[PDB]
């Protein structure tokens, strides 16, 4: 509820407007304030993005993973919040 | 080139035909025979599935992550090969 209010956002790779990037960081911050487990954090972010920015989003949250994904233009972000990586993108 | 020929496949969650599940395991096995890094393993699997089973697939490979994703019916698998988890699904 406040333990994330000091975490550092580092954008690693984005194809996304600055405003939507900010919203992704804000959403992930909110998720991590509420939830401890990666799957629940990912669920919160995905559902919020489906509401704010239309379906269909997909979210991966974790400390060790690689990915290869396809996304709609201007709808991709990969970033860290503290030591946790978040992949968030729209496809479908 | 042979160091994966003794690894155990454990299906955790699937919405997929038995034959396609077998192909996913086989594909991941081939990928891991060739590539050491999770991102390259994921890329190999995604590209093969796009070819064999049509676009658009997405693949996550790693030891620590959670996810929340949406997929087309009958086109989802989440499994381990040895100690590495593989998420593979079709959306778009």
């Amino acid at each position: 509820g406040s333990h994330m209010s000091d975490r550092k956002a580092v954008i690693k790779n984005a194809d996304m407007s600055e405003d939507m990037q900010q919203d992704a960081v804000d959403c992930a911050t909110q998720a991590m304030e509420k939830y401890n487990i990666e799957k629940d954090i990912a669920a919160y972010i995905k559902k919020e993005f489906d509401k704010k920015y239309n379906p269909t989003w997909h979210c991966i949250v974790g400390r060790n993973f690689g990915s290869y994904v396809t996304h709609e233009t201007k709808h991709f972000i990969y970033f860290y919040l503290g030591q946790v990586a978040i992949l968030l993108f729209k496809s479908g | 080139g042979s160091h994966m020929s003794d690894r155990k496949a454990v299906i955790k969650n699937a919405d997929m035909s038995e034959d396609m599940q077998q192909d996913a395991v086989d594909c991941a096995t081939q990928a891991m025979e060739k590539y050491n890094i999770e991102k390259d393993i994921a890329a190999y699997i995604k590209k093969e599935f796009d070819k064999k089973y049509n676009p658009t697939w997405h693949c996550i490979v790693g030891r620590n992550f959670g996810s929340y994703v949406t997929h087309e019916t009958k086109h989802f698998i989440y499994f381990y090969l040895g100690q590495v988890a593989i998420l593979l699904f079709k959306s778009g």
């Binding site: 790779n13 690689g66 290869y68 993108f89 | 890094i37």
Partner: peptide, 12 residues
């Protein structure tokens, strides 16, 4: 690599 594909890897 296609423009709308992406490949990610976590740091060590």
């Amino acid at each position: 690599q296609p423009k709308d594909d992406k490949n990610t890897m976590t740091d060590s």
